[PDB]
């Protein structure tokens, strides 16, 4: 179809600091207490 920098711009714009990014921090965090979930079931280990 019709593909180029308008639909990166636009896109782009269609992202005023709304809480869409937010959203990447409660990854972050997820991905943090998931790792640390691995760690203390080493703990157990016996």
Same mark, same amino acid.
């Given at each position: 179809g019709v593909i180029d920098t308008s639909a990166v711009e636009s896109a782009i714009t269609d992202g005023q600091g709304d809480?869409? $990014?937010?959203?990447?921090?409660? %990854?972050? $965090?997820?991905?943090?207490?998931? %790792?640390?979930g691995l760690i203390y079931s080493m703990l157990r280990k016996a």
């Open positions: 809480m869409k $990014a937010i959203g990447g921090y409660i %990854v972050g $965090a997820l991905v943090i207490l998931a %790792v640390a």
